[PDB]
């Protein structure tokens, strides 16, 4: 067998697929260490295995562990190395359903935990992205040359999958995991690659697309009419008709049984899909090319909530460019220690500019807190109006370590943690927040407008920076169609409520310009106090300013309201050594006409 | 089944007529698929990397002397390109070029009924060459028409 | 082709073709460029090339949106590192105005903003213009008349 003689380990194999995939590689003469929680399902996985396969006793082994937890996980990767002593296929297709709930009604706490809820948006995401994280942070040290990692990913990571925020943003977290890993492990010589099933025939599709259709307060069958017109290919069916319907396990089976073996040894960072020929957008992504036009924006009596980490520039960057457009601003930390040098850094403005600056407003907002969160809505609404507008940077701007699979525990635990869940628990709280406002008729208030802008830190590159921004674009796009379907079915109730949530993203870690930021802080304002609607989830910023001109900052200060005005004129000035005569050959100059300037002095003309 | 070349998105000097016609046939893949699957025959595209060959040594001295350059830069560079190591005659672990052989078997897997749900995909023997997919972008502002002149 | 509203393949199969064909030209170009640096020649500069797309258009003004950015490329010193430049299915990315343009007043407006400003007769004549013109400017304007119906 093409698999025979080498050690395979299945993540969370008590499944459908995963009993698909045991029973293919235990025929191809593999063995199979089968993990998960519960001891009574590998036990039955291997007994009827066993029975059915007529399998020895000798290949199957049960490994009954908590894939979440990275030190349990630990514990069984030294006991499985210390009874088999290498391992050499790694399938990471363990997984959740997550909670099938909307943002503005997702499960927070377990209290919260509803009828149709499993797990809450913490669990799900440990037991969807950390997990694997772990497996292979573990499993390398112990996987000798010519080993294989295939993780079964999902197709749906790249759609516009209603209502399953937690199952789909950890999903797309993991491919970005599995190129960079792949990248990193390509030096140790052990292939990763990767699959993209589609809608996989079973009950659990089912009663997924079943609860997909009431949410979206959709007739039944929608989800699944629409999914299998995203398809190109027709099989014959047990009648022999040529008809569209989900992919089986078995294609997956053996896709997964060809690429560990050696025959796709050339193989590295690859996707295969067994789709039928699904139709997505593969991405989604745009670059800025002119500079911001920022002279007709007006922001008066709007609101701009920050939810900001450890990063103090920008902060204040983002404060003067806002004060710029008239908005006034509130401010929330995650740790509170930030929050005091925020509070430093203010201290030292004021005493510099003297009294007329006013010192921002400062609340604190952890995302492990719903109460800060709530307190700061509330102090907003009494105070300010409401919130209108959201800018949402990362956790940290420190730099994470520059591997993925040497950083340490702890390390793991709070980029999951904080850039991730916290990320999530934010938007679902700001989404509640502007679902549940209602609005007095005839007049037109605008949407909220939300801003992610990821890891402004250039210079360096990283890649916790590229898994942050899927992940967020993920929860853009998904987050979009949420609060688009969500005033739909307003509308038809005929209640007057604030317009669709518009978010997009704003990357920088590609730049390598010193004036990066200020060009992402007015690009950030203009997006988020304009009328514009970018369809793009994604705007990146080009790596070196070349696009419009130059100009440094352009910027509108002292020309603008008189260049052009004498374009095409030919002017000549007598006397303009200095002085007035001077002034007005140089503003004529910037107006676009044509100068001779005429003097004596041969040096001050020059 | 189609057999393009990866260096028809790559900077692939001095060979538009080898490099235009095969990015035109890529595209052509995808529509190909795309009306084929209405009338049912599968179509896969494969992007083999430098193949072990004479030909491609030759190609590469080629390209090395039309840059002025030394000859093994274009083999370093296009190897630095690479991911992967393979295991050598002698066991030992190396950036080396795809062999036929993998090719005819990833071939063989597109053809036989096992890549029944494949449809318009590519698959890459390469090593793991890391090539950027496109370079795209949307005209999403107005332009700045006042400080433009064009005297002569 | 600017040919729009109806979709085109042998538009996109151009397309990757013209594409692939400014890549390597450039690259060509460039290294020609320090080739001739190398030899202290003055030689003119590395050809600058660029794809405009236009089929992803379903508007109308998408054709002098084009050409404007066509003349921009062409005239100033803008330099873009993608080499295909596609154009929004609907221009609702910078404001709208449809020829925005610059004409008749670009030099106005902003140099009032922040301003409130009470005129008074504004019905007709030089009340309106004035109030019109200075409304343009970014000021907040309070139209004092007699008759409603000039006024609104």
Same mark, same amino acid.
């Given at each position: 067998?093409?698999?025979?003689?080498?050690?395979?380990?299945?993540?969370?194999?008590?499944?459908?697929?995963?009993?698909?995939?045991?029973?293919?590689?235990?025929?191809?003469?593999?063995?199979?260490?089968?993990?998960?929680?519960?001891?009574?399902?590998?036990?039955?996985?291997?007994?009827?295995?066993?029975?059915?396969?007529?399998?020895?006793?000798?290949?199957?082994?049960?490994?009954?562990?908590?894939?979440? &937890?990275?030190?349990?996980?630990?514990?069984?990767?030294?006991?499985?190395?210390?009874?088999?002593?290498?391992?050499?296929?790694?399938?990471?297709?363990?997984?959740?359903?997550?909670?099938?709930?909307?943002?503005?009604?997702?499960?927070?706490?377990?209290?919260?935990?509803?009828?149709?809820?499993?797990?809450?948006?913490?669990?799900?995401?440990?037991?969807?992205?950390?997990?694997?994280?772990?497996?292979?942070?573990?499993?390398?040290?112990?996987?000798?040359?010519?080993? +294989?990692?295939?993780?079964?990913?999902?197709?749906?990571?790249?759609?516009?999958?209603?209502?399953?925020?937690?199952?789909?943003?950890?999903?797309?977290?993991?491919?970005?995991?599995?190129?960079?890993?792949?990248?990193?492990?390509?030096?140790?010589?052990?292939?990763?690659?990767?699959?993209?099933?589609?809608?996989?025939?079973?009950?659990?599709?089912?009663?997924?697309?079943?609860?997909?259709?009431?949410?979206?307060?959709?007739?039944?069958?929608?989800?699944?009419?629409?999914?299998?017109?995203?398809?190109?290919?027709?099989?014959?069916?047990?009648?022999?008709?040529?008809?569209?319907?989900?992919?089986?396990?078995?294609?997956?089976? &053996?896709?997964?049984?060809?690429?560990?073996?050696?025959?796709?040894?050339?193989?590295?960072?690859?996707?295969?899909?067994?789709?039928?020929?699904?139709?997505?957008?593969?991405?989604?992504?745009?670059?800025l090319?002119?500079r911001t036009d920022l002279?007709?924006i007006?922001?008066?009596?709007?609101?701009?909530? $920050?939810?900001?980490?450890?990063?103090?520039?920008?902060?204040?960057a983002?404060?003067?460019m806002?004060?710029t457009?008239?908005?006034?601003?509130?401010?929330?930390?995650?740790?509170?220690?930030?929050?005091?040098?925020?509070?430093?850094?203010?201290?030292?403005?004021?005493?510099?500019?003297?009294? &007329?600056?006013?010192?921002?407003?400062?609340?604190?907002?952890?995302?492990?807190?719903?109460?800060?969160?709530?307190?700061?809505?509330?102090?907003?609404?009494?105070?300010?109006?409401?919130?209108?507008?959201?800018? $949402?940077?990362?956790?940290?701007?420190?730099?994470?370590?520059?591997?993925?699979?040497?950083?340490?525990?702890?390390?793991?635990?709070?980029?999951?943690?904080?850039?991730?869940?916290?990320? $999530?628990?934010?938007?679902?709280?700001?989404?509640?927040?502007?679902?549940?406002?209602?609005?007095?008729?005839?007049?037109?208030?605008?949407?909220?407008?939300?801003?992610?802008?990821?890891?402004?830190?250039?210079?360096?590159?990283?890649?916790?920076?590229?898994?942050?921004?899927?992940?967020?674009?993920?929860?853009?796009?998904?987050?979009?169609?949420?609060?688009?379907?969500?005033?739909?079915? +307003?509308?038809?109730?005929?209640?007057?409520?604030?317009?669709?949530?518009?978010?997009?993203?704003?990357?920088?870690?590609?730049?390598?310009?010193?004036?990066?930021l200020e060009f992402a802080c007015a690009w950030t304002a203009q997006l988020?106090?304009?009328?514009?609607?970018?369809?793009?989830?994604?705007?990146?910023?080009?790596?070196?300013?070349?696009?419009?001109?130059?100009?440094?900052s352009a910027s509108?200060?002292?020309?603008?309201?008189? $260049?052009?005005?004498?374009?095409?004129?030919?002017?000549?000035?007598?006397?303009?050594?200095?002085?007035?005569?001077?002034?007005?050959?140089?503003?004529?100059?910037?107006?676009? +006409?044509?100068?001779?300037?005429?003097?004596?002095?041969?040096?001050?003309?020059?």
């Open positions: 067998g093409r698999l025979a003689g080498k050690i395979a380990l299945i993540t969370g194999g008590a499944g459908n697929i995963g009993s698909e995939l045991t029973r293919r590689f235990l025929a191809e003469g593999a063995t199979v260490i089968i993990s998960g929680r519960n001891r009574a399902k590998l036990t039955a996985l291997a007994e009827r295995m066993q029975a059915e396969a007529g399998v020895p006793a000798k290949r199957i082994d049960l490994e009954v562990m908590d894939g979440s &937890d990275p030190v349990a996980v630990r514990a069984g990767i030294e006991a499985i190395v210390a009874r088999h002593g290498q391992i050499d296929i790694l399938v990471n297709n363990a997984g959740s359903a997550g909670a099938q709930r909307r943002l503005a009604e997702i499960p927070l706490t377990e209290a919260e935990l509803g009828p149709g809820a499993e797990e809450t948006l913490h669990a799900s995401i440990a037991n969807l992205l950390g997990m694997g994280w772990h497996l292979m942070r573990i499993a390398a040290p112990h996987m000798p040359v010519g080993s +294989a990692v295939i993780n079964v990913s999902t197709i749906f990571s790249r759609a516009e999958y209603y209502g399953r925020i937690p199952y789909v943003t950890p999903k797309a977290a993991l491919n970005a995991l599995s190129q960079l890993a792949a990248r990193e492990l390509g030096a140790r010589g052990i292939r990763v690659n990767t699959i993209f099933p589609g809608p996989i025939e079973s009950d659990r599709i089912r009663t997924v697309f079943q609860r997909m259709d009431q949410l979206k307060g959709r007739p039944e069958g929608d989800t699944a009419h629409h999914f299998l017109n995203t398809m190109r290919l027709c099989r014959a069916n047990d009648q022999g008709a040529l008809e569209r319907r989900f992919p089986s396990v078995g294609d997956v089976a &053996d896709a997964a049984v060809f690429l560990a073996s050696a025959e796709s040894a050339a193989l590295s960072g690859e996707t295969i899909e067994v789709t039928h020929g699904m139709e997505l957008p593969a991405c989604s992504e745009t670059s090319l002119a002279r007709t007006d922001a008066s009596g709007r609101t701009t909530l $920050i939810c900001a980490g450890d990063q103090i520039e920008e902060v204040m983002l404060t003067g806002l004060r457009c008239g908005s006034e601003v509130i401010i929330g930390f995650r740790s509170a220690a930030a929050l005091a040098q925020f509070e430093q850094a203010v201290n030292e403005s004021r005493r510099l500019a003297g009294a &007329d600056f006013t010192p921002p407003i400062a609340l604190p907002l952890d995302p492990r807190d719903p109460a800060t969160i709530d307190a700061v809505f509330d102090w907003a609404g009494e105070n300010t109006g409401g919130i209108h507008a959201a800018v $949402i940077l990362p956790a940290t701007s420190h730099e994470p370590a520059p591997c993925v699979i040497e950083v340490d525990d702890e390390r793991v635990l709070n980029f999951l943690a904080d850039e991730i869940t916290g990320t $999530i628990v934010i938007a679902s709280r700001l989404a509640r927040y502007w679902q549940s406002q209602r609005l007095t008729p005839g007049a037109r208030a605008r949407g909220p407008r939300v801003i992610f802008l990821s890891n402004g830190a250039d210079q360096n590159g990283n890649v916790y920076g590229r898994i942050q921004s899927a992940a967020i674009g993920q929860l853009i796009r998904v987050w979009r169609h949420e609060a688009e379907l969500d005033y739909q079915r +307003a509308s038809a109730a005929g209640d007057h409520v604030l317009p669709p949530v518009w978010a997009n993203q704003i990357v920088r870690f590609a730049n390598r310009s010193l004036e990066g988020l106090h304009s009328q514009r609607h970018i369809n793009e989830i994604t705007l990146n910023i080009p790596a070196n300013i070349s696009a419009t001109t130059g100009a440094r509108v200060g002292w020309a603008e309201s008189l $260049i052009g005005l004498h374009l095409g004129k030919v002017a000549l000035i007598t006397g303009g050594s200095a002085g007035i005569g001077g002034q007005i050959g140089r503003l004529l100059a910037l107006s676009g +006409a044509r100068v001779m300037l005429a003097a004596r002095d041969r040096h001050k003309l020059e």
